[PDB]
Structure formats: C-alpha cells, structure tokens
Symmetry: D2
C-alpha cells in the first residue's frame, strides 16, 4: 500500500513570549488540523486516527492531541495519541501514521506537531512530599524536560558548542550560514512563498484582536548586529542566538491516506512517502545523527544526494545543517531555500512535520520533485523522511 | 507476517508514596525492559525500536523512554519513543509495535509503559510571565494532565460516579465485585500465580537495601473495611477507594517480533497477537468504551465471546468491568481471574501492556488458548487486543 | 525632656512595578536614613538606635532595619529594631522613638519606615510538610499579611466600600475629593513644594534620578468620573479615590531637646504629644476620628489651634469622614495632596506625612500641625507637632 | 517610674514539625497572653497596649500581634504592634514595654513573642515580574529572613563554627556543656520545676484532643548520641545538633506595669526590671555580642557578676554561653540552671522573653534575689535585662 500526503497546513512560528503567547498549544494544534482537513477535500467525520508530537504537555490538561482534535472540529469517534520523540515528535507522528496505513489499521489519518514554549509551565519536584528545610530549585519545564540532556543536564546548545569546535566550525563560517537564512526567510516572507504552507491566526488580547500570517522571528531581527552578538552557551563560545534555532510557538498537520483511499475519493494528494529511517547514537552526538539518518534513508529507498532536488534539514544549530551538508556533500542552494529555524523558530514538537510540508511546498514553487527532510533529536537521534510530488 | 509476543515483564505496583517511590519511572521502565529482553533469550543489541507509554512526563527529564532503554542496557543504536494515549498508552505502545512489525520497519521491538504517580511534580502556570498581583494556583501535574477531563476539569472518578448512577450500579453491587478482586488478588500472591510475569525491583530503605516482588495494595488492603469506606467523587456517592483503582507506580515491557523472526532465531514465542481495535466517543462516557472496543475487536477478528477462554478488562472502577461484562454477557469466573486495578493498583502509563501480560500468564497457568484484553481511556476511548498461546 | 524632629528625608513614591522597582525597600530606607542624618547636620556615629516600619519583610533577608542602617552608612554599633503596626508602621517607629528618648534609653534616634510593595514576594504554606495530592494556592504576601483582614480574608477597600455606604458616601462626593487631591499634587510638583522633604533616588538599568512622586505624572484628571470600581461590581471606590500601591521610604532624626541644643542644631519641629485608637477591624476607616479625639484629650488642644492637618488618604473617604466628624476645613488638610494621588508605600507613610506636614506648616506659614492615618485590625495613630 | 513584671506564662517549646506544628504562631501567643493576664489578677480590658516579637511573619496574616491579642480575649480597644530584633525580638518587646511605661504612655502593657518555624512558608522572589526563562530558586523564609546573615547568606551556625575555631573551643568542650544542659532539662521536666512558668497547650490531629505540657527536645534527646553526631555546619566541624539551639515553636508573654499601678490594684509583683542594655557589632561577631551586652548592663545598672545570683544566657550554640562564661568569669552552676536552647529549643521570636521567665521562676525555686538574662542577636547584636525579685 503506497502512502500519500493529501493536504498540509501549519501556524506562523511565534518567538518566545511573542505573537502567539496568548494561544495554548492545543488551540494552535486545532488551527493546523482544522485547515489540514478542509484543504484535503475530506470531512472531519472521515478522519479515523490523529497522532500529534508534543514535547512539553505540562499544563496542557488531559490528552493534549484529544483536545486539539475536538477543537479542529473532529468527531469524538476519531481516536487521538500524543507522542514525544523530542524534536522529531512531528516526523515520528508521520512515520507512525505511514506504517499504520501500510498495516491496514486505518485508511485516513492526520499526523502533525504542536508547541507553545511560551506557556510551558514551571515544576516543583519535592513540594508533593515536602521540602522540609533549606532553599530549593524551581525548574523551567521547557529546559528540564526539553532542552537539557537527562544524564548531564547540559543544554542541547552546550553539546552543539563541543561538537562544533571538534569539527572546526569558526564564528565566521557559522555566521555565513545564519546570515543567508535571515535573507531567505525574508525573501520568502516577501515573495509570499510561505502563505501557501501557512494558515493565519486570530489572537485576542487587551489591544483588541489581531491576524498573524507571517513568521515572527525574522521580522524582529537585525542582520548587521550578527558578528557582535555575545556567545550563548560558553563565555568564549562560537555559538550565539543568530546561528542557534529560536525558542518559538506553533503547530502543523498533514492528512495521510493510502494511494487507493485517495484514488477512490477522487482526491489528488500533494505527495507520496517513499520511505523513512531512524538514526540513533550517543546523546553527545545528537548534532550529527542527521548524517546517518539520511545515510539509512538513501540506503532503504535506493536514493543518493544526486537524485534529490531539495532537502529540509532543521537548523537546530547552523552547524547541524552545515556538517550534514559538509559530510553528505550537499549544495547550499538546495537546502532550506526559504530559510531554516535560526530565522523562523523551532516549536520543538511541531518542526518535524512543518519541514515535511515546507519541503513538499518547495518542490512545488521550484517545480522540483524528489525531496528529503531530516532533523536531529536531543537524546542523540535523527529521523529522515523521503517523499515525491504527485 | 504473523506477529508474536516473545516474552514480557512487569514490576510490582506500589501504592501512592510507598514501596516503589524512591525509584523513578525511567528507572522502573529499565528493570522491566531488561528482564523482558533477557527472558526472550535475545541480546540488547538485537532490539531495533522501543515504544514506552507515560501519561506524566513532568520532572522525568528529556526522553523518558530514551532513559528507560539506555539505563536497562539497550545500546544507543536503538530508537526510543514516548507515547501518551492516557491510561491506554501501554496497550497502544504494543498496538503501534504490532503495526510497525507488520509494516516491515522493524523485526525486533520492545513496547510497554512506565509511571511513578508518587513522583509526579506540581506546576505554576504564570510564574514565567508574571502573577502581577493577587493569589495564584499551584497545580498537581497528575490531576491537571492525567486524572481530570480537559473540557470540564472533572476527575475520571466523577464521570464514573454519574454513569454508575445512570446505569443504576448500587453501592452493594460494586463492593461484591471488589470484595472478589482482592480475594483473587491475595490468592495469586499467596500461591505465586504472578511470579512468572513479575521482575522484582530493588529499593533503599533506612535499613539498607530490600527487594519488592509482590504488589503493594493487596497487602495494605483490609477486606472487612470495603463495606464502610467513604465515597471518593461525590459526598453520597457509590464509588470508594475499594471499587476505584488506586494511584500506583510501576512499569511493564513486552518483546514483540514477526513469527519468522522468533523461528529464524530458534525461539518459542509465548503467544500471538490475533488483532486489536479502538473505540472513541464523548469524553464523559469513557467507562462504556471498552464494550465498543471489544465489539470492534470481535468484528475485525471474527471471534465471538464464546471463542474466548480468558478476559483482561482493566478495573479503573469496578463499574467499568461490571458493565463491559453485563452488555457482552461475560462470565465473572473467566474475567480478571487473578484480580485487577481495584485490588492490585493502576500505574496509568503501564496498566495497558501489563494486562496483555497477566492474560498470557493466566492462559498458560489455567490452561486456556484464546484471550481478550481491553481498557477504558480518559478522553472517551478504549483499546482492545486479542491473542492466542502457541 | 521635650522631643525635637531635627531633620528628615523621604524618597519619591513610585508606582506598583514602577520607577523604584529597581531598588529594594532596604536600599530606599538607606537613601532616606543617610539623607536624614546629613540634614540633621550630625555624623552617622552620633545616631544611637534606628527603628523602621516594615509591613512586608519577606525576602528582604535578616533584620531589614539593621541592613538599611548599615547601607545608609551608620556604624555596626547602631541598635536596629524592625517593626510592623501595618500602615501606621512609620508613625509608630516615631512614637517608639518619642518614648525611648523620653525614658533616658537614648539621645539621638532615627525612625521612619520603608516599603517595596513592588518586590513583595509570593508564599506557599503546605510545601514544607508536603502538598501530597490536589491543587494549591500560591499567596501574594502583599494581600496575605498587608491588605486582607485576618478574620475574613476581605481586602481593606472592601471594608471601606462597606463603611462609605453605611455612612452614605456617593461616587460623586468621593471623585470630587480625588480631583482636588490630584490637582494639589500636580500643583506641588510644578511649584517644587516637595523638593525640601524629597531626596532624589538614582536607579541604574544606564542610570536616572527619580525626584517627583510618579502617580501624579501618569494620572489623567479627565478620567476620574470614568474609572470602574475596584472592590464590588456596584462600587463607589476606584483607582482614583483609593490609595495606590507604592515603592518609597521615609526617615526622621528625633532628639531630646537637651541633645538638640547641646549640638548647636536648629530643629524643624517639637513633638507635643501622640495617641493610638484601637477598635473593630471593620471600622478601620473610622479609627482616625478616635485617634485625634484621644490626641485632643491628651494635648489639651481643639481642631481650633491646628493650622494644617495631614490625615493620610488611605481611601478618599477616610479623610472625608474625619473632615465631617471633627469639623475640619478641606483648605487646612492634605494641602499638597495625599495618598490617593502621590502614593502609599504602606510601612513608610506613617513618617512621611509627619515630614510633609512640617514642610507645609513652614512654606504655608503655620505653627501647630496634626498627623493621623488609619490602620488594619481596627486602629489608628495620631501625632501632634509644633514648629520652632 | 519603676517597672514590675506581675506575671508571665510560656507554651512548651515544640520541635521542628513536632508536637505544636498544628497550632499557628498566633494561637500560641494567644494561649500565652491569656494565661499571662489570668495569672496577673487583672481583666483583659485593663491591658492598654501589646508588643509581640515575631521574626518569621510571612503567611501569619495581617497584624500577627493584633490577631493574638484578640484571640487571647483582649478587647479591640487594647491596641497591638509586632516587632523584629531577630533572636532577641522577645526581650526587645519587654524593653520597649519598660520604656513606654517609664515615659507615661500606658499603665498596663503585655510584652512577649511567638514563632512557629514549623509553619514558616516558602517564598518565590521572581514570581510577580516573571521568571522569563531558566531555573529559579524557592527560598526558605526561616533561612532567608531568619537564620542567614544578609551580607553573606552564611548560617548563624557557619559564623558560630568559625568563631569557635578562632577562640579555640574543642568539640569535646561543647559536648561536655551540651551533656550538662540536657541532664538539667531532663531532671527539670521530671521533678516538675518548669510547671509554674509553663502553660499547657491543647491541640487536635486525627484521634482527637492532646495536652502538650513538656518541652519536646529533652524527651526525644539521647545523651549517648551527643559525641557520635555528625558536624552540623562545616565539613569536619565541631558544632553538632546537640550543641546548637534546636529549630522550635512556642510563645511567651509577660504582664508589665509601673510599680505604683501594680500597688493601686493591690498586686504582689514577681520582680522589678532594674535595667536593660543593648550591644551591637559587626554581624560575624554576633556570637560574642552577649559579652558587650552584660558589660554595658553592669555599666548602666551599677551591678557586677558577684551581685548576679543566676544568669539566663540563651545558648544559641553551646559556645555562646561558654565564651560568655569564660570572659565574665561565670560558673555553669549559676547559669541556665534548668538547661537551655540546645536541650529545650529556640523559638527565635520567643526565647528573649521566655528566658526572663525561667530566670525569675529559677530565682523563686532555688533561693536568690538578682538575675541577668542576655541572648545573641543575628546581625552582630545582643540585648540583656537585669531584674530583682520582690
Ligand atoms: C540562543 C538563545 C540562548 C538566545 O536566547 P535569547 O537571549 O532569548 O535571544 P534573543 O534572540 O531573544 O535575543 C538575542 C538577540 O539575538 C538577535 N537575533 C536572534 N536571532 C537572530 C538572527 N537569526 N539574526 C540576527 N539576530 C538575531 C535578536 O534580535 C536579539 O538582539 P538584541 O539582544 O540586540 O535585542 C536561546 O534561543 C536558546 O536557548 N536556544 C534554543 C535552542 C535549543 O537549545 N533547542 C533546540 C533543540 S535541538
Ligand atoms: C479513590 C481514591 C481517591 C482513594 O485514595 P485515598 O482515599 O486518597 O487513599 P487510600 O487508597 O490510601 O485510602 C482509601 C482507604 O481504602 C483502602 N483500600 C484501597 N483499596 C482497597 C481495597 N481494594 N479493599 C479494601 N480497602 C482498600 C486504603 O488502603 C485506605 O484504607 P484507610 O482509609 O483505612 O487508610 C484514589 O484511589 C483515586 O483517586 N483513584 C484514581 C482513579 C483514577 O483516576 N484512575 C484512572 C482511571 S482511567
Ligand atoms: C491597586 C489599586 C490602586 C487599583 O489600581 P489597579 O487596578 O492596579 O490599576 P491602576 O493603578 O493602573 O489604576 C487604573 C487607572 O486609573 C488611573 N488612576 C489611578 N489613580 C488615579 C488618580 N488619582 N487620578 C487619575 N487617574 C488615576 C491609573 O493611572 C490608571 O489609568 P490607566 O488604566 O488609563 O493607565 C487599588 O485596588 C488599591 O488601592 N489596592 C490596594 C488597597 C490599599 O491601598 N490598601 C491600603 C490602604 S489602608
Ligand atoms: C543544626 C540543625 C540545623 C540540625 O538540624 P537536624 O539535624 O535536622 O536536627 P535533628 O534534631 O534531627 O538533629 C539530628 C540528631 O541530633 C539529635 N539531637 C539534637 N539535639 C540533641 C540533644 N540535645 N541531645 C541529644 N541528641 C540531640 C536528634 O535527636 C537527632 O537524632 P536522630 O538522628 O536520632 O533523629 C538544628 O539543630 C538547628 O537548630 N540549627 C539552627 C540553629 C538556630 O536556631 N539558629 C539561631 C541561633 S542564633
């Protein structure tokens, strides 16, 4: 059973306590789902199972993906599951779906991601039992259960820093990358090349109500300020907020069906999924997992870099994409052509699925075909997806 | 591809803030993954993917499943995912493993779940942005994200209370069900009926290091109190501690394979997955979802209630199993033979893959072949799974 | 011995999360205590004991008075006590100062009070023992130990809304008083009538100097009839006629008259007497009336000998009911404004008004002044001072 | 004007989370004031002003002293104030009462103090504005505002340990001191000595009513453990729990008058206050501050050490009383005749007044006319009262 991506939608990527702060992650998951369905040509009735990535579901209340579904308009007959594969949660949702559909368990499914890092709460670890005496920690849940390694408590960035140096990556080369990302993720917000993949967002507030249709981080940045930005993860450090992905808010969804189920509803799906692959190695090498994730996909699928037109390779850290580009021998003109998250943002739970939609939607406006999205995973993993335009 | 369970393991269930409280959920997941992969007569290296349920990941640190697997001794070359299908994550985890094994992504998988309700933290919702002025809230993570309806903010036990009344389930009727679960629960401890499936878990007291091997509630549970306990969800309600499931810490792991992977490796699997099904409906009517689940199971399999030797139906509340039994016309003596969650405890992330495994235990020990396992899920859902001994 | 106020100084009074939010209460107290000393015209060493009002001592660390004394440049040998009789803190510090200086225990004292209401933290009450199971409250310290009655957890503007109503005080009456206040306040700033009592603060974020109270620069006169209530949906009390929440500090160098002379100092005022009034916590808005009644019974005065009163504007209505029941002239009360318009950093104000009263009495010509403010738990104090 | 103490009473001192963790600071002062006034021969009305020391008010409510004054049965006309001179607050309040009486301001006053370090809250300093990002602290209000010096954040202990090394006091010397303290406490608890000064306290819990009428530490203390105890404050230090004042709850209250006011109502008072002294030095030298206090006292009063029949030198640590006894040449046979803080306990707000009581009680039961009571005050300070029976 050949699996196909019928429709796809995703929210703007609102930066930390920025545009979409007054929206709950769930509410952002709806906007993505609700519009992924409408763009498909199906009804809500006719969705069997949802799978949503969600890394920080503290304070999201019971069954985060259940809520996102009911709000998106879906019936209570529809089954839902929240998953956490950290920064791959969104691309793991698509792969769980893709396999369930190969195994005849459903014929129509949605598979997106969702994060409001802004309203990720705070946590008290000993307050249940009693702190008894002495001061104590109160932990950033975004940080504690998201950005910092379980063993070392070191920031995903701290590791990027170590790995970077070790492979030779100078302030200047890492600034070359993060500088073009700001122009590309402004060249597309200009040529309006992202309005297609995106669905704007009606936000409340004291200052009346407002529409949000554009990626927040790039329009509130400075491209000249870059080679003076203080280091972010080590006093004498090469990594800064320019070349490190942003803390941001958003969601995204895809409708997935079998070839037949789509050829039987006379729907014309955007793309077909050719294969997926998981890379897994040591937490400290999370920044490099992408190399082997593709090296596995290129393996299972029979493809090479050369037979690929575009790649969406998440910029958790400019060096991730760089070293992945370096190691696999990828021309920079064929990688994140509308720019990566070091310009746009990275709502950890959502990106996996966004970059699939963005990839898809680039193969379209660039009249390309064969594509590969990969992202890195805190805990030392990558997930690689490979699809084809229809 | 006929899909086989090959071996399985499940920790003792400890009461809220008792015998398994020192140990984390990551750490109970490890004990259980280890002792499963071993009993299967395979090596760590041989495990390709892991799928671990977990409803309460606040305070668990990055990738709760990644830490479970690593700590167990699985090499980092082994993919790790955390899912949340509320109280059904265990069963879903198995159900996903199932379809992925079918699909062809993997031949060897570990799937299961882990939870320490005792070490669920607390959350401040506005500590990040600022409480400006006036009193604020501090939220029990277990209740806010695990144990109460998203929409209304009402506890599972409250929705259960309303439906007990509506279906006219009397104080007396429910106790009798529970006065039986505990009798069955102590009998298995007494005569070692659950030894096959339990790994013991080694803990630190102030007296040095002791082993826990038995479930906690069956021991700390006084049978001649059940008629005089107070109601739990309504001042004058029917549902008490005794006929509601206890809040528990535990984990459980199963080793799944294609039948021709067990064959190739010269192994004797325990049982076969014949089929699975889901049911979804109004989040207020979740206790009535297992009935549909099993109906959906019977349809997808071709099984009837007569072709079924033994049943596992998770006793979230005595009324859940009582009502699935009434409608399906099931025979008490062939349903939760060794007792359920009302006597033995309910580690929410875990109880979905543990029951799969008590079933495989009872079927072999009581001399059955065909078994059905199912449980209700908050959000208005349930999962069912059907299996046959080899 | 008669008691002189040698000199004084008080900070600007910033808003809630406003201009002196970047300064702790201990640091404001400091600014106030240092500039008081300098003015008295004596050495930090000459001061023998420091008493400060502090309502909200959570997270100011050990002995808040003590820290302030030290940071103000007073030596380690300088006695330090920190006290709380709520909003009357500042003025009780000056009444404990009076009684010490009367009884031979000292000669040179500093008294006043300090309050960052902005940086008042939040508290948890069960987290030491353990929360165990079920949700919990995170209480504001401001509200729990300052603004909400003990027995009834009811705010003070709630009790004052209730009093206004029984004593029949309309939105109109009140919004009027509030308008005259904000004018007299806005007037004093342009005129510089408060430059003498005030000591500027240098906040560092670069760095800038706060010199004028902050509320009266950001309070529209126009919109007073258009403010929504604050304590009950069908309310007559608003942001305009109820005191606003304020950073600020105030200190005051008291001597025995003998030590004043014996140092060649020319002091500002003499403390002729003082009184406390204590009654039912619901009737806190009415305690000033008793306060001043006892103060007259003691001093031997009548409202006649008073040239100017400072009866704190805790709520517009507290002054408006004292003004009724004592027969006081709005023209002879809170001349440069009051709490409603300027601010009310709760610990500080008790002393501040003693200081403003003295700056006015001078600039406006006048000998005899009276200070009174209302206190939760059902109390008030009054001071009776005379210029020299 | 001559000042007299007409009566007092004092709660038994509770241990930290011990046998008065279920009464507030306020209800303890309440129990104290009431019995004080009862023993005084007077009517609650006749009390004109109330001064109560309390170091840890956070969470106690508005006007801790007021609350207590009322709950004792003192009318609303009897006005109230709360003061804070750290560990000598309770003495300070008596000194202010003495001065106020002297000056003409009242006729009958009540001075005392109250602490419940048990029921002291935890604080979040950065909540109101917001934590924005990264982990925070939750700060013990007993440590922050009570037991750690402002400048350094070091514990009173840490200063006491560093002082004890410099002035060369050996662990074995402080343990000999501690050992005679506790034997004195135990002899005192059992022979009934403290009963004339103690007022029993009535509580609830599960079972129903309890009467606490005995200091808790002397009854839970094991003489033998003294020299085996770990070092409390430095890695390989000399200061242990047995020779540090215990964290405790309690309260005390004295009924003071001028001499003529007590005769006018025809009452035989217990003792005349003769003088008080205040010492103040750098915060690291707080430990030695009682020496200045009794120096300045001797200086004001006219008195010398051979005039003083008994001392109450509160033992914040064994090494205060010891360095204090060394310097003024005192005999532990004449100082803390019934034990002190190390054995019984240290309710910071209360000890100051309490020990004025024990001193008196002691001088009546052991024959003796002249007394001195001093205690060291966090922040480099110390107060001291001298008093004469009548
Ligand atoms: C890098 C990090 C520490 C920076 O946090 P921050 O302090 O909030 O940074 P901000 O971007 O908000 O502000 C810093 C400056 O960078 C600038 N900036 C940010 N992105 C920029 C870009 N692409 N180009 C140019 N300037 C940029 C901002 O405009 C701002 O300028 P200013 O300080 O002069 O006003 C933070 O984003 C982080 O923790 N990174 C998350 C990555 C991570 O670990 N997780 C990814 C999962 S693998
Ligand atoms: C019902 C509930 C509130 C009871 O917890 P509790 O009263 O706080 O704690 P306990 O269970 O210790 O107290 C109940 C009492 O009954 C006893 N008890 C528990 N199970 C018993 C049994 N099977 N037989 C007899 N006695 C039993 C306890 O041991 C205890 O005895 P005690 O009162 O003398 O101490 C709690 O179990 C709960 O909320 N359950 C959650 C159910 C849930 O949400 N699960 C998910 C469903 S999808
Ligand atoms: C806090 C309190 C002042 C209410 O204010 P708030 O809700 O925080 O709001 P603000 O202080 O911003 O006031 C609201 C508006 O009225 C304005 N305002 C307040 N006082 C004003 C005055 N005297 N004249 C004109 N405008 C005024 C503010 O500037 C603001 O204008 P804006 O909304 O257009 O910006 C009031 O509830 C209060 O006093 N609480 C504490 C109780 C107390 O004082 N107790 C101690 C006395 S015993
Ligand atoms: C040092 C301190 C923090 C230790 O806390 P702690 O160790 O939790 O206190 P504990 O009472 O549990 O002491 C540990 C042991 O010492 C024992 N102990 C304490 N005082 C004892 C005594 N007088 N005789 C015998 N044993 C004693 C306890 O019984 C306990 O034994 P256990 O292990 O069987 O329970 C505490 O005693 C203390 O009071 N410190 C602060 C001092 C203070 O009040 N500061 C203000 C002074 S200016």
């Amino acid at each position: 059973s050949d699996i196909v991506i019928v429709a796809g939608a995703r929210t703007p990527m609102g930066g930390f306590q920025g545009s979409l702060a007054g929206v709950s992650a769930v509410d952002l998951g709806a906007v993505a789902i609700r519009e992924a369905v409408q763009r498909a040509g199906i009804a809500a009735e006719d969705v069997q199972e949802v799978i949503m990535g969600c890394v920080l579901p503290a304070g999201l209340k019971q069954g985060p993906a259940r809520q996102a579904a009911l709000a998106a308009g879906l019936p209570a007959a529809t089954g839902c599951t929240t998953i956490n594969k950290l920064c791959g949660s969104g691309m793991k949702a698509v792969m769980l779906a893709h396999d369930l559909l190969k195994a005849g368990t459903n014929q129509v499914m949605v598979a997106g991601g969702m994060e409001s890092m802004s309203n990720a709460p705070y946590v008290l670890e000993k307050a249940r039992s009693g702190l008894r005496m002495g001061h104590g920690e109160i932990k950033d849940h975004m940080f504690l259960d998201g950005l910092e390694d379980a063993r070392t408590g070191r920031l995903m960035g701290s590791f990027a820093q170590e790995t970077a140096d070790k492979y030779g990556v100078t302030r200047e080369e890492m600034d070359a990358y993060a500088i073009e990302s700001l122009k590309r993720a402004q060249a597309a917000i200009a040529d309006g090349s992202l309005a297609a993949e995106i669905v704007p967002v009606t936000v409340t507030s004291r200052k009346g109500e407002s529409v949000v249709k554009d990626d927040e981080q790039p329009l509130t940045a400075n491209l000249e300020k870059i080679p003076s930005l203080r280091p972010a993860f080590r006093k004498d450090g090469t990594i800064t907020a320019a070349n490190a992905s942003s803390i941001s808010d958003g969601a995204s969804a895809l409708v997935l069906m079998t070839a037949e189920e789509a050829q039987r509803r006379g729907l014309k799906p955007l793309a077909r999924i050719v294969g997926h692959a998981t890379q897994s190695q040591d937490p400290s090498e999370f920044t490099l997992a992408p190399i082997g994730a593709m090296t596995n996909l290129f393996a299972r699928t029979g493809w090479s870099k050369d037979d690929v037109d575009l790649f969406e390779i998440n910029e958790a850290f400019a060096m991730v994409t760089m070293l992945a580009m370096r190691e696999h021998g990828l021309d920079h003109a064929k990688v994140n052509v509308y720019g990566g998250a070091c310009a746009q943002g990275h709502p950890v739970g959502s990106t996996g699925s966004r970059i699939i939609l963005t990839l898809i939607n680039a193969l379209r406006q660039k009249g390309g075909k064969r594509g590969v999205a990969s992202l890195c995973i805190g805990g030392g993993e990558a997930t690689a997806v490979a699809l084809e335009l229809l």
